[PDB]
Automatic annotation (TrEMBL), chains B, C:
Protein's name according to its UniProt entry: DUF1641 domain-containing protein
Superkingdom, taxonomy of origin: Bacteria
Amino acid sequence: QRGAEVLSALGDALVAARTSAPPAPRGVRGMWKTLRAAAKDPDVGRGVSYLIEVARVFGSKV
Amino acid sequence: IANNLTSAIGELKALNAADTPIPALAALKDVDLAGLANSLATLSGGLVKATPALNAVLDSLTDQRGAEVLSALGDALVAARTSAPPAPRGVRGMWKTLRAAAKDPDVGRGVSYLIEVARVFGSKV
Amino acid sequence: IANNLTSAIGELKALNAADTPIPALAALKDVDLAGLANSLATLSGGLVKATPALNAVLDSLTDQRGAEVLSALGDALVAARTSAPPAPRGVRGMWKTLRAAAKDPDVGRGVSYLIEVARVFGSKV
């Protein structure tokens, strides 16, 4: 069931992102501003915790 | 009795049901039907249990935005085999290429979208 | 009458029409045909609606460059189980490995291509 929930959450995240994505970072200063906004966000926080977790559990099996 | 059989046969002809002829099953011999049946049987207990996960994937494809995103990813892979910039030679080349990409407004949209997916996915996990 | 039946069968024998020899269809009871039908029934309304997304995926696979890219990704996953370098021990090891990768010309091509995909996807979103 956790695999089904993860795929639902990825599909919804792609479908939502076509409509909710923030305006494009203009240049290296814009890119650093957007990355420094994302690195404050608690939900981008959960997504990065999960991707570090997948990289650990995959990396425990390879 | 011949007139009775004529009226009986004459009734049968009037009845109409949809009929379509498509006789091309020859490649079934070419198909490894015996092997494929083993593959399907092995996966049937997995497929039946995976039905809720397969439906949740399909539901995300029933949104037109899901179709547009997959089209845009497929085109981006196919184009990139022909449009990709020459390889960054060494750590100074790598930093030059990353500093060129971090000026590009279209790489800008792609990074905005990947930060968005990481937020919306991270809102659900 | 025997000669009439002989000429009739002799015309049946000269049939001259399509004929195929296929004899193997074993392993159907083992298949959970009813179970797959149950999976298909819950999935049919999803599959029919997903047809435009499934076509947009298939269209990106009809380009030979799409086939080449998927072959190159599959081979890279399979090879990496056997060729991957020993694990970076700690933050100093991690920076040494990343600084080795950022000298490699083939990791160079891979990073050029991923920046290209992020540009072409980012030109369509």
